[PDB]
Design an enzyme around this catalytic site. Structure first.
Site, PDB file in Angstrom:
ATOM      1  N   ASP A 131       0.845  -1.181   0.000  1.00  0.00           N
ATOM      2  CA  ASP A 131       0.000   0.000   0.000  1.00  0.00           C
ATOM      3  C   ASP A 131       0.887   1.239   0.000  1.00  0.00           C
ATOM      4  O   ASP A 131       1.910   1.286   0.687  1.00  0.00           O
ATOM      5  CB  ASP A 131      -0.904  -0.015   1.230  1.00  0.00           C
ATOM      6  CG  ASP A 131      -1.900   1.111   1.236  1.00  0.00           C
ATOM      7  OD1 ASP A 131      -1.961   1.861   0.243  1.00  0.00           O
ATOM      8  OD2 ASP A 131      -2.616   1.255   2.249  1.00  0.00           O
ATOM      9  N   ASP A 137       0.038   4.817   0.574  1.00  0.00           N
ATOM     10  CA  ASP A 137      -0.191   5.817   1.614  1.00  0.00           C
ATOM     11  C   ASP A 137      -0.307   5.124   2.969  1.00  0.00           C
ATOM     12  O   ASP A 137      -1.287   4.421   3.236  1.00  0.00           O
ATOM     13  CB  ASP A 137      -1.445   6.627   1.301  1.00  0.00           C
ATOM     14  CG  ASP A 137      -1.128   7.974   0.684  1.00  0.00           C
ATOM     15  OD1 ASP A 137      -0.079   8.096   0.012  1.00  0.00           O
ATOM     16  OD2 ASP A 137      -1.929   8.913   0.875  1.00  0.00           O
ATOM     17  N   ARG A 157       0.424  11.140   2.115  1.00  0.00           N
ATOM     18  CA  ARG A 157       0.437  12.360   1.303  1.00  0.00           C
ATOM     19  C   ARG A 157       1.825  12.994   1.184  1.00  0.00           C
ATOM     20  O   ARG A 157       1.945  14.033   0.525  1.00  0.00           O
ATOM     21  CB  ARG A 157      -0.550  13.423   1.818  1.00  0.00           C
ATOM     22  CG  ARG A 157      -1.966  12.896   2.051  1.00  0.00           C
ATOM     23  CD  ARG A 157      -2.745  13.784   3.010  1.00  0.00           C
ATOM     24  NE  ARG A 157      -4.149  13.398   3.120  1.00  0.00           N
ATOM     25  CZ  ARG A 157      -4.958  13.811   4.092  1.00  0.00           C
ATOM     26  NH1 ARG A 157      -4.503  14.626   5.034  1.00  0.00           N
ATOM     27  NH2 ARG A 157      -6.224  13.418   4.119  1.00  0.00           N
ATOM     28  N   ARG A 170     -15.178  19.036  -3.766  1.00  0.00           N
ATOM     29  CA  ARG A 170     -13.796  18.605  -3.586  1.00  0.00           C
ATOM     30  C   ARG A 170     -12.876  19.773  -3.257  1.00  0.00           C
ATOM     31  O   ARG A 170     -11.999  19.649  -2.395  1.00  0.00           O
ATOM     32  CB  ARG A 170     -13.300  17.878  -4.834  1.00  0.00           C
ATOM     33  CG  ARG A 170     -13.914  16.505  -5.048  1.00  0.00           C
ATOM     34  CD  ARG A 170     -13.326  15.501  -4.086  1.00  0.00           C
ATOM     35  NE  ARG A 170     -11.897  15.302  -4.304  1.00  0.00           N
ATOM     36  CZ  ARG A 170     -11.157  14.433  -3.625  1.00  0.00           C
ATOM     37  NH1 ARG A 170     -11.710  13.674  -2.687  1.00  0.00           N
ATOM     38  NH2 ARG A 170      -9.863  14.319  -3.885  1.00  0.00           N
ATOM     39  N   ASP A 195     -17.034   7.560  -2.421  1.00  0.00           N
ATOM     40  CA  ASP A 195     -16.503   6.911  -3.608  1.00  0.00           C
ATOM     41  C   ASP A 195     -17.559   5.972  -4.180  1.00  0.00           C
ATOM     42  O   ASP A 195     -18.217   5.242  -3.435  1.00  0.00           O
ATOM     43  CB  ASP A 195     -15.237   6.130  -3.260  1.00  0.00           C
ATOM     44  CG  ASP A 195     -14.114   7.024  -2.767  1.00  0.00           C
ATOM     45  OD1 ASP A 195     -13.977   8.158  -3.266  1.00  0.00           O
ATOM     46  OD2 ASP A 195     -13.366   6.591  -1.867  1.00  0.00           O
ATOM     47  N   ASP A 207      -2.472  -1.245   5.325  1.00  0.00           N
ATOM     48  CA  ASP A 207      -2.771  -0.558   6.578  1.00  0.00           C
ATOM     49  C   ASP A 207      -4.062  -1.062   7.205  1.00  0.00           C
ATOM     50  O   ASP A 207      -4.045  -1.755   8.228  1.00  0.00           O
ATOM     51  CB  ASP A 207      -2.888   0.952   6.352  1.00  0.00           C
ATOM     52  CG  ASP A 207      -1.554   1.614   6.085  1.00  0.00           C
ATOM     53  OD1 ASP A 207      -0.514   1.012   6.414  1.00  0.00           O
ATOM     54  OD2 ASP A 207      -1.551   2.741   5.542  1.00  0.00           O
ATOM     55  N   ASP A 221      -8.622 -12.575   0.356  1.00  0.00           N
ATOM     56  CA  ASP A 221      -8.555 -13.259  -0.925  1.00  0.00           C
ATOM     57  C   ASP A 221      -7.483 -14.332  -0.826  1.00  0.00           C
ATOM     58  O   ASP A 221      -6.289 -14.020  -0.752  1.00  0.00           O
ATOM     59  CB  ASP A 221      -8.260 -12.287  -2.063  1.00  0.00           C
ATOM     60  CG  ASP A 221      -8.525 -12.891  -3.424  1.00  0.00           C
ATOM     61  OD1 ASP A 221      -7.626 -13.587  -3.934  1.00  0.00           O
ATOM     62  OD2 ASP A 221      -9.625 -12.676  -3.978  1.00  0.00           O
TER      63      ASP A 221
HETATM   64 MG   LIG Z   1      -3.172   2.999   3.376  1.00  0.00          MG
END
Ligand SMILES: [Mg+2]
Length: 238
Positions: A6, A8, A15, A128, A175, A202, A216
């Site tokens: 992952d 972020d 960020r 946004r 989303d 995370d 999975d």
């Molecule tokens: Mg993350």
């Protein structure tokens, strides 16, 4: 065998760019007799490449949850949500969303109410573009009235026919992506004679982004806390 990450929070502080403690560790992996490195993150590729400085460490780079794949810093191929819904159903979900965002009584409305990414359609009643404060300021207005959860309940039911899922996005947006396009999508690109794939994320719990990947069966998942803990989980077992 490939390694999966992952972006972020797992490889970098969210960020911001990547500390050198970590990249020194990845170089040792691709320098250990038989390892390739790949990443999967929700962000568009420009943000991802910005975050990791060097796409060259990574054989395969998967952005927007694997609906966009990159290789040797070339795009190769990747589909779009409009190719799924089609121009008709799209101009149905769209104008239902604006007509709802319109008549919604909230204190502050701005702009970019519907952002079309390749993977998801980001819907946000405040908008946004609003100074980071207005983002937080609406987040607390959400805790009082649950304005955004009411939004998904309309879309999730009205468009239950669309094979669509509407999961609460960040602080100010929901989303909207097609069912089964979580993060397990990037498995489609990895029939490349790869015997074992290890994943590191995370929020590997239900109600989280990388949850659907962990369980999975196809791959062993590891839950890490933070990037410094990650480097520990790599050094300890590898
Ligand atoms: Mg993350």
């Amino acid at each position: 065998a490939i390694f999966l990450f992952d972006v972020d929070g797992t490889l970098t502080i969210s960020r911001k760019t990547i500390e050198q403690n970590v990249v020194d560790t990845l170089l040792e992996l691709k320098s250990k007799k038989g390892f390739v490195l790949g990443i999967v993150g929700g962000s568009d590729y420009k943000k991802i490449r910005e975050q990791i400085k060097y796409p060259e460490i990574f054989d395969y780079i998967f952005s927007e949850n694997g609906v966009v794949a990159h290789k040797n810093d070339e795009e190769y191929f990747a589909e779009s949500i409009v190719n799924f819904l089609g121009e008709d159903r799209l101009k149905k979900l769209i104008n239902y969303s604006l007509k709802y965002i319109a008549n919604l009584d909230i204190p502050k409305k701005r702009g970019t109410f519907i952002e079309l990414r390749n993977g998801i359609i980001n819907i946000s009643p405040i908008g946004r573009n609003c100074s980071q404060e207005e983002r937080d300021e609406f987040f607390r207005y959400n805790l009082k009235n649950n304005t955004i959860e009411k939004f998904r309940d309309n879309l999730s039911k009205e468009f239950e026919d669309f094979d669509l899922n509407f999961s609460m996005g960040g602080q100010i947006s929901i989303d909207c992506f097609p069912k089964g396009w979580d993060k397990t999508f990037c498995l489609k690109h990895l029939e490349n004679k790869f015997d074992e794939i290890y994943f590191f994320g995370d929020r590997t719990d239900k109600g989280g982004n990388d949850y659907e990947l962990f369980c999975d069966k196809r791959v062993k998942g590891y839950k890490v806390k933070n990037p410094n803990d990650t480097v520990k989980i790599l050094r300890e077992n590898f």
